[PDB]
Design a binder for this molecule. Structure first.
Ligand SMILES: [Ca+2]
Ligand SMILES: [Ca+2]
Ligand SMILES: [Ca+2]
Lengths: 119, 119, 119
């Protein structure tokens, strides 16, 4: 669920706040369109995609689904007690949070005018 | 709930995405004010007022209420097993998804700059 | 949870809608950054902070947590049946709703260009 995803990003990029990622580029934020502006935005495109696949499990609602995972020293893992929905949503979230820790954060790419950069 | 409404719009308007509707006109987004810029936006105004009505029943929280419905070949039905709030929120959404498939989508009305047109 | 925060604002400032606050200044919406534009925006900044403290309780998810409170003609109380998470989220909410009632509402600070005045 949404809070768990915010917590995974805390596990992996403790220095940044959730809101630095929530409105970044063309994809980290509601929807997405265009070509990802950089590698971080590319992480977001892969995550919007992954949620899309997860949503084909009937009744699987990514932002509301509570799953089971563990953070240990910057490492993330999805536990075995997850049902199929919970296991897919958790996997989407941990791959995005790991991806965000390895991308450079470009401040010029936060809160961009989507109308001019993301066709 | 929010995801079910998204899926009802996938049932009637398979060609468009939720985000196409989420920032359209003066009402389809967060709130609403002024004169519906067209017939799609008017579907949203009607949806906004139906949720206001639904919120009158104690503890009826429309975005969070899971209800029961069926999508069969582009047809939506709110099935009878679910309680007063559930029944009502289902009907609000059903009617809005039907309405969206009937109205034309004016691409020049997506994310209008609200101060100028919704007074 | 978010509908209960909406109803607390209705107890305290019955003459305004939820949406007048949802998009005000630098803080009242999603996130926040910058210098609070006025006393109402400062109420929101303190509330965003209060939620970050409440989120330090494991599993305490402010928008989703249902708590128990009473609205008695403009006064609010968080009731004693709340567990620690619910009591913390209720208090954040309560204090923000009381703060909103004592602040002047500035129509020119509604839905501002965040880029120009909040970073
Ligand atoms: Ca996105
Ligand atoms: Ca609306
Ligand atoms: Ca805020």
């Amino acid at each position: 669920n949404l809070y768990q995803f915010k917590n995974m990003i805390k596990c992996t990029v403790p220095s940044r706040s959730w809101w630095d990622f929530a409105d970044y580029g063309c994809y980290c934020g509601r929807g997405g369109s265009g070509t990802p502006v950089d590698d971080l935005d590319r992480c977001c495109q892969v995550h919007d995609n992954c949620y899309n696949e997860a949503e084909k499990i009937s009744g699987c609602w990514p932002y509301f689904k509570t799953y089971s995972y563990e953070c240990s020293q910057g490492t993330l893992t999805c536990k075995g007690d997850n049902n199929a929905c919970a296991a897919s949503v958790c996997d989407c979230d941990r791959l995005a949070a790991i991806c965000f820790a390895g991308a450079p954060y470009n401040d010029n790419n936060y809160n961009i005018d989507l109308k001019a950069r993301c066709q």
